[PDB]
Each structure stands twice: as structure tokens, then as C-alpha cells.
Amino acid sequence: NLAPLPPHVPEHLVFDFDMYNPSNLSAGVQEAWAVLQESNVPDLVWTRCNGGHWIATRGQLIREAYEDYRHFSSECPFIPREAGEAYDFIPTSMDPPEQRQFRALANQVVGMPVVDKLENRIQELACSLIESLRPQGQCNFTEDYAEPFPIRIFMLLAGLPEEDIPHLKYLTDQMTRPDGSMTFAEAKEALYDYLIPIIEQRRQKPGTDAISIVANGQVNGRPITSDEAKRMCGLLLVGGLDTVVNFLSFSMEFLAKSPEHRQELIERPERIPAACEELLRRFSLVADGRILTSDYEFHGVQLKKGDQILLPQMLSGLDERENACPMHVDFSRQKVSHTTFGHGSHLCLGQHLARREIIVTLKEWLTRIPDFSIAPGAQIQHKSGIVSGVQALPLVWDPATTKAV
Ligand code: HEM
Numbered sequence: 001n002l003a004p005l006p007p008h009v010p011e012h013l014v015f016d017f018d019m020y021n022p023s024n025l026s027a028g029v030q031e032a033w034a035v036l037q038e039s040n041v042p043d044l045v046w047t048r049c050n051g052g053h054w055i056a057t058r059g060q061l062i063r064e065a066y067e068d069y070r071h072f073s074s075e076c077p078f079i080p081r082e083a084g085e086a087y088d089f090i091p092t093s094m095d096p097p098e099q100r101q102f103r104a105l106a107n108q109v110v111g112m113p114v115v116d117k118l119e120n121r122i123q124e125l126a127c128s129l130i131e132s133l134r135p136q137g138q139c140n141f142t143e144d145y146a147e148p149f150p151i152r153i154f155m156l157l158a159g160l161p162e163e164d165i166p167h168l169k170y171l172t173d174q175m176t177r178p179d180g181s182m183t184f185a186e187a188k189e190a191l192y193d194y195l196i197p198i199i200e201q202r203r204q205k206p207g208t209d210a211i212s213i214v215a216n217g218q219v220n221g222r223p224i225t226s227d228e229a230k231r232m233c234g235l236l237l238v239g240g241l242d243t244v245v246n247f248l249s250f251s252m253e254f255l256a257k258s259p260e261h262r263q264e265l266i267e268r269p270e271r272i273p274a275a276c277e278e279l280l281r282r283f284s285l286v287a288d289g290r291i292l293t294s295d296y297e298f299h300g301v302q303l304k305k306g307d308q309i310l311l312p313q314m315l316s317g318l319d320e321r322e323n324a325c326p327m328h329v330d331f332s333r334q335k336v337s338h339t340t341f342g343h344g345s346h347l348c349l350g351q352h353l354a355r356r357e358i359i360v361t362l363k364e365w366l367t368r369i370p371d372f373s374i375a376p377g378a379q380i381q382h383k384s385g386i387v388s389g390v391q392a393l394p395l396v397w398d399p400a401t402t403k404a405v
């Protein structure tokens, strides 16, 4: 299902990439997207899939488009258009200068100072989850750790019941990795239906949770509205539930397959921070975009007003111009270049939280379960979309080689 090429699109620029079902998926999701960076592909291409849109394939263009909010607007950041149109999360669907006030608030909730406050729980949950797994010599890492670890920390931050997870998780998944089961507007509506009562409850009787803080915040000297709070929280959920979860699986899948990388972190712990950035570069997983506010010539390609462009945050760091031997994991790279957390005014607020969750996990897992591998004959399946994921990750290990702490 390729849409007919618009008249302004030169046929030499066509490359029919399906962000939702890329051809090389078997090889891995990063590898499947990396095809866009082969010598045969122009830097800026047009795909006829998903209704037709542009894709920037290079770190250079991605960074520029991100910096340029005057031309590339956040207003409609998701492909396909219907999804981008229904998308109304704050601060993500807004441009500066309006964005700024909303960002300052979300920052109060997810920011540095919150991490510093939650540090002991993160460490506590990580240790508890691992210890519980250790003696079993086998898990489903995605269901057993990747999911509960980050999610329970989020549920804690948000003051939401663990009971709600499954429901919330599903709706979130529909938004980033649509199934066909529900349209974006539908999913969005369901999420909002969930939240509305909660926001109401917390405007009345405020707590110390993230929702209470957002529901009663000030923006541009006045109180946030119910609709604004709902739009903020909807974003917080997607970030809390769907990002860190997916990243850990990719990282763990890699560690499971590379004994020498595990060893390196075991002996040279001082390398964990560097390694964490290198995994962020190598297993980058977000791809959203922007919308042209007007006709604009960019790197000699004529973009028309209303055109959408995918600016895959995932691709910057896989770009050979940015990182020599990009598909290779090297914890001792002199410079790890990526835009895994974005670039420009929308730079990820939760990055501090995400790095803490990653680093604790590496340190704590390796401490207790230094030697593990993928279950014999398990075929690991990746999934692509706005946020790419791993379907399941069966791990196996010998209990006898683990260490209780
Ligand atoms: C590995 C984990 C994560 C990745 C790769 C990631 C990636 C991103 C990216 C690429 C953007 C910008 C999108 C754009 O420019 O359209 C973003 C923005 C955002 N992320 Fe993160 N994120 C992660 C974790 C989180 C977490 C855990 C939270 C909160 C619980 C979160 C909250 C946010 C918020 C609030 C923004 C919007 C900032 C603004 O618009 O000013 N993120 N993230």
C-alpha cells in the first residue's frame, strides 16, 4: 500500500521504507533501519508507505531539522498523518516559545532532583527483582524484568495502582507500535478516559505524586488547565511505560550474546557510564518527526507546506559520518555521538531517570548473574515503530555460577 507520489517529489528521491514493517527485520531493528544509510540512498528520501512522507537519513540533517522549529513543527510529530493529527501531548506537540513553560513543569516531576530522591528505591527494586530471578536459571527478561522494573518505578512516581499496568501498557503499545487493533485516536481516547477522573481527584485532594504536581502546577503565571494536565500526563505515561522497557531488552539481548562485553564491565566497573552511552548509541530506538510549516528548500530538496518528515533519532548514532564502525559495540570509543534522547528544544527530560535505571540494571545484574545466554533455539523478534521493541527474550543460565548479594 504505496500512496501515489505527489507532484513535487522527484522520482530519484523515492525509497519505499515502511517504518512499521521494514524489510530486514529479521536481522534486527537497528540493522533494518540502517539500510537507509547505504551508499545507494540519498540523504533525504520520500517513502510512499504510511501515506507518504520524507525521511532524513543522516545525523547532520536530523540535528538541523530538530534545531529549526520555525520550519519543522512539532505540531504533527507522528506518522501516519491521522496519528500525528490526533497527537496532542504536551510538551511534545508544541513549539517554542510556548513549549518552555510546560517543559519547566514536566521537569519538576521527572528531572534531576527527582532521580536523586528515587535513587534508593530504584536500587532496591532492581536488586529485589534480580535476586528473585537468580535461582531459577531462566526467565522471559521482557516480562520478568524489563517491564516490571521501570514500570513499577513509574507507578510509584505517579501514585498509580500496579493493577492498572496491563491496561495502560496495551494502550501505550498501540500508540508506538500499532497493531491494526485500534487507531491512534481510539487509543488516545481510552488513555484519556483513564486519566481524567484521576486528575479531577488530584486537583481536589492533592498528593505528592507526579500527577498531583502536574494537575496543580502554574504555567505562565496562571494555573494549568484540566485539559493541559491530561495532555501532559498522557505523555508521561508513554515515556514511563514504553521507552526504558524496550531499551533494556535490546541491551540485555546484546549482553547475553557477548561474553567479552560482560567481562569488561565486571572487571572495569569504572567503564559502566561509558558503556551505557555506547549502548544508548547502538541500541537507539525512537523515531518521530516534524511537519513543514511552509514551502522550504532543505539541502536542495523542495519540501512543501504540510509535508511530514521522519527525523529518526535512532539514525544519528548509526551514521558512519558520526561514528566509525557504527554497528560495532566499543565501550572505549573516544567520542560516542548520538541523539537517542533527541535534540533541540524537545530534548528528553527523562534522560536522567533512564540513565539511572540502565546503569543500576547493568551493575546489579552482572553482580549476581555474570554468565547467561539466550535460550537454545529461541528466535528473538524485534518490532519497529515510533518506539521499537523486542517481542520476548528467553534467557537461561546455570544457578551454580550466580552470586547472591
Ligand atoms: C531510553 C529511554 C528514553 C528514550 C530513548 C527517550 C527518547 C526521547 C525522545 C527522542 C524525545 C523527543 C521527541 C521529539 O523531539 O519529538 C523524548 C522526549 C521526552 N521524553 Fe524521553 N525518552 C526516554 C525515557 C523517558 C522517560 C523514562 C521519561 C519520563 C518518565 C521521558 C519523558 C520525556 C518527556 C517529558 C519528553 C518531552 C520533552 C519536551 O518536549 O520538552 N522519557 N524522549
Ligand SMILES: O=C1C[C@H]2CC[C@@H]1C2
Pocket: 089, 092, 238, 239, 286, 288, 386, 387
Ligand atoms: O510521544 C513520543 C515522543 C518520544 C517519547 C515518547 C514517544 C516517543
